[PDB]
Structure 1
Amino acid sequence: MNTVPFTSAPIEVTIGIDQYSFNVKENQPFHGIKDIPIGHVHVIHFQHADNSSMRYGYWFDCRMGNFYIQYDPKDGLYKMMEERDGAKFENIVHNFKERQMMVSYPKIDEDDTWYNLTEFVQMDKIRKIVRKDENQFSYVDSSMTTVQENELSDPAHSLNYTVINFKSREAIRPGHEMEDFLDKSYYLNTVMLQGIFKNSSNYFGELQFAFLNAMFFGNYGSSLQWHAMIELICSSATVPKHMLDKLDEILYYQIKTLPEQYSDILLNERVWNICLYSSFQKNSLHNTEKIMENKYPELL
Structure 2
Amino acid sequence: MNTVPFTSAPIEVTIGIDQYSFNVKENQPFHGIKDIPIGHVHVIHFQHADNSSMRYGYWFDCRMGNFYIQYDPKDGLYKMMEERDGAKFENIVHNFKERQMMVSYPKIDEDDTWYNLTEFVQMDKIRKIVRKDENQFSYVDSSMTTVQENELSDPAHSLNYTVINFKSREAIRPGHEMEDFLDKSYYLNTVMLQGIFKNSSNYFGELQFAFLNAMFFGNYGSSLQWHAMIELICSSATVPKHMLDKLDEILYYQIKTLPEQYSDILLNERVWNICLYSSFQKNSLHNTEKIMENKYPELL
TM over 0.5: yes
Displacement after TM superposition at 1:45 (Å): 0.1
Q: Within 2, Cα distance between the matches of 1:150 and 1:52?
A: 25
Displacement after TM superposition at 1:124 (Å): 0.1
Cα deviations by residue, 1:262-284 (Å, 9 ceiling, x for unpaired)? 00000000000000000000000
User: Which aligned pairs between 1:48-59 and structure 2 lie closer than 5 A?
Assistant: 48-59=48-59
Displacement after TM superposition at 1:5 (Å): 0.1
Cα deviations by residue, 1:172-207 (Å, 9 ceiling, x for unpaired)? 000000000000000000000000000000000000
Report % sequence identity.
Answer: 100
The alignment partner of 2:33 has SS state of: strand
The alignment partner of 1:27 has SS state of: coil
Displacement after TM superposition at 1:288 (Å): 0.1
Cα deviations by residue, 1:34-66 (Å, 9 ceiling, x for unpaired)? 000000000000000001110000000000000
Displacement after TM superposition at 1:131 (Å): 0.3
Q: Within 1, Cα distance between the matches of 2:53 and 2:76?
A: 14
> What residue number does 1:23 align with?
23
Q: Within 1, Cα distance between the matches of 2:51 and 2:17?
A: 19
Q: Within 1, Cα distance between the matches of 2:272 and 2:98?
A: 50
The alignment partner of 1:262 has SS state of: helix
Displacement after TM superposition at 1:158 (Å): 0.1
The alignment partner of 1:136 has SS state of: coil
Displacement after TM superposition at 1:228 (Å): 0.1
Say if 2:87 is the partner of 1:79: no
Displacement after TM superposition at 1:250 (Å): 0.0
Q: Within 2, Cα distance between the matches of 1:27 and 1:263?
A: 34
Cα deviations by residue, 1:215-243 (Å, 9 ceiling, x for unpaired)? 00000000000000000000000000000
The alignment partner of 2:169 has SS state of: coil
Say if 2:146 is the partner of 1:151: no
The alignment partner of 1:29 has SS state of: coil
Displacement after TM superposition at 1:299 (Å): 0.2
Cα deviations by residue, 1:13-37 (Å, 9 ceiling, x for unpaired)? 0000000000000000000000000
Q: Within 1, Cα distance between the matches of 2:53 and 2:8?
A: 22
Q: Within 2, Cα distance between the matches of 1:203 and 1:54?
A: 28
Q: Within 2, Cα distance between the matches of 1:71 and 1:207?
A: 31
The alignment partner of 2:110 has SS state of: coil
The alignment partner of 2:248 has SS state of: helix
The alignment partner of 1:167 has SS state of: coil
Residue segments in structure 2 that go unaligned for 5+ positions in a row = none
Cα deviations by residue, 1:244-297 (Å, 9 ceiling, x for unpaired)? 000000000000000000000000000000000000000000000000000000
Cα deviations by residue, 1:42-101 (Å, 9 ceiling, x for unpaired)? 000000000111000000000000000000000000000000000000000000000000
Q: Within 2, Cα distance between the matches of 1:171 and 1:186?
A: 8
Q: Within 2, Cα distance between the matches of 1:278 and 1:299?
A: 15
Q: Within 2, Cα distance between the matches of 1:178 and 1:76?
A: 52
Q: Within 1, Cα distance between the matches of 2:135 and 2:3?
A: 18
Q: Within 2, Cα distance between the matches of 1:123 and 1:83?
A: 18
Q: Within 2, Cα distance between the matches of 1:4 and 1:288?
A: 35
Displacement after TM superposition at 1:209 (Å): 0.0
Displacement after TM superposition at 1:104 (Å): 0.1
Residue segments in structure 1 that go unaligned for 5+ positions in a row = none
Q: Within 1, Cα distance between the matches of 2:62 and 2:149?
A: 32
Displacement after TM superposition at 1:130 (Å): 0.1
The alignment partner of 1:67 has SS state of: strand
The alignment partner of 1:236 has SS state of: coil
Q: Within 2, Cα distance between the matches of 1:93 and 1:52?
A: 30
> What residue number does 1:164 align with?
164
The alignment partner of 2:30 has SS state of: coil
Q: Within 1, Cα distance between the matches of 2:170 and 2:251?
A: 26
The alignment partner of 1:293 has SS state of: helix
Q: Within 1, Cα distance between the matches of 2:266 and 2:15?
A: 21
Cα deviations by residue, 1:116-147 (Å, 9 ceiling, x for unpaired)? 00000000000000000000000000000000
TM-score w.r.t. the length of structure 1 is 1.00
The alignment partner of 2:70 has SS state of: strand
Displacement after TM superposition at 1:208 (Å): 0.1
The count of aligned residue pairs is: 300
> Aligned-pair RMSD on alpha carbons?
0.2
Q: Within 2, Cα distance between the matches of 1:92 and 1:218?
A: 34
